[PDB]
Design a protein around this ligand. Structure first.
Ligand SMILES: [Au+]
Ligand SMILES: [Au+]
Ligand SMILES: [Au+]
Ligand SMILES: [Cl-]
Ligand SMILES: [Cl-]
Ligand SMILES: [Cl-]
Ligand SMILES: [Cl-]
Ligand SMILES: [Cl-]
Ligand SMILES: [Cl-]
Ligand SMILES: [Cl-]
Ligand SMILES: [Cl-]
Ligand SMILES: [Cl-]
Lengths: 172, 172, 172
């Protein structure tokens, strides 16, 4: 094992590699969502921007996990990335529903890794997650929930109108 | 339950609402302490200012708890606020003793909520308390203990003299 | 006990005093390492500077522990400081190996104190260590491990050459 490794279980090391794969899969999903909203037959620029910014945040989360794996003396191991679950993402409402389902799965994976760290008595790992991940996911999920309420109140009987207005007046 | 709620127990949700009530009660107590020291027959401006600033800090603590309740998908519920325990607060020594008793009760309520979060495996809640509340209460209680030692060493056999000097030279 | 003390076990108080002694011993060891590399017959200025800066960081860690002991209402108690384990420290490789052994002992003492805090349900203590100590030790141990790999790849069959180059091009 590493010259530096101390109090770092093989179970946590493997779970960190699987979480890197989830975050990179989530980034890839957001890349697909963003380019879908840039299609000329979809054409919602603020929705495109919202998802492209999330693609960058999820890749940054993966790279912070990989930095920490090396700082603890674990060994990064990469696996195939599965393509996103859809090729076309429907309305902004459909896309925001898929986004909050994706973020709740990331949050559950973070909470499961925290529970493993707590069982392994690994307080650096618990610190790391509580400082860089758990509050970021709660805030993002709250933000998506607010958006989903506003998109839903705009459907009325003029769904196209509501979709334009949300993009223009909430997402710029 | 919320579209956003995840890993957030009904027990924690209720305990957060009760802690909001404690913090708003503490704010109300500090408002009363501050206006008492502004009476013309008490007239200790630095003591007034010390307690009025604490009234604001305790209201800010309540509003940060309420923000977090909504970020987790819980439901704020407000109850009646009881009036403070006294209408007149005696000397600066009496008032500082009542203040440290009040802050030790807030600290115990924070530690009890942390213990509930730890039993519910709610690391976002534990993070939140450890980042925004626990060190603020330890520092404030230390600061009050320092003040109580200085007020006590000033009583001597010239209590009025000591009360003036403490207000002038420690609390500006 | 203190007017301020709350949820602060005698076991944690004593363990904090022992950790202060370890940190001051580590500072003293780094003072010795730094002055050894300033000898005219050793003369590695970047190595001197590296260890003198660690002597200051370990003394600062002791003083932050002592500040927290007083903020919790415990009582600082100082013991004799043992001299460092060596009077002469060999090559930069020998010195960096002794440094990472010393930092791994500090890290284990921090993890043991965190485990005691967790058993005593002392979340302020756990917070304190996770915020000011645990990530600083992981980062430093990683940094020393990187240095040890670079020093080792420079030994070749020209050890003096490698020792000069490391000092000049990594440690300025
Ligand atoms: Au942990
Ligand atoms: Au927890
Ligand atoms: Au703890
Ligand atoms: Cl544009
Ligand atoms: Cl697939
Ligand atoms: Cl407008
Ligand atoms: Cl004035
Ligand atoms: Cl009442
Ligand atoms: Cl003066
Ligand atoms: Cl020089
Ligand atoms: Cl000795
Ligand atoms: Cl050069």
């Amino acid at each position: 094992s590493s010259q530096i490794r101390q109090n770092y279980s093989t179970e946590v090391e493997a779970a960190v590699n699987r979480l890197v794969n989830l975050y990179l899969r989530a980034s890839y999903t957001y890349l697909s969502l963003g380019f879908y909203f840039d299609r000329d037959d979809v054409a919602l620029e603020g929705v495109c921007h919202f998802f492209r910014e999330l693609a960058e945040e999820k890749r940054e989360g993966a790279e912070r996990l990989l930095k920490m794996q090396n700082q603890r003396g674990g060994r990064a191991l990469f696996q195939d990335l599965q393509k996103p679950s859809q090729d076309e993402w429907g309305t902004t409402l459909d896309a925001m529903k898929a986004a909050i389902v994706l973020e709740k799965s990331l949050n559950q994976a973070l909470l499961d890794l925290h529970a493993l760290g707590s069982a392994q008595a690994d307080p650096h790992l618990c610190d790391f997650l509580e400082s860089h991940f758990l509050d970021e996911e709660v805030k993002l999920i709250k933000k998506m929930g607010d958006h989903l309420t506003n998109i839903q109140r705009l459907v009325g009987s003029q769904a196209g109108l509501g979709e334009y207005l949300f993009e223009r007046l909430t997402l710029k």
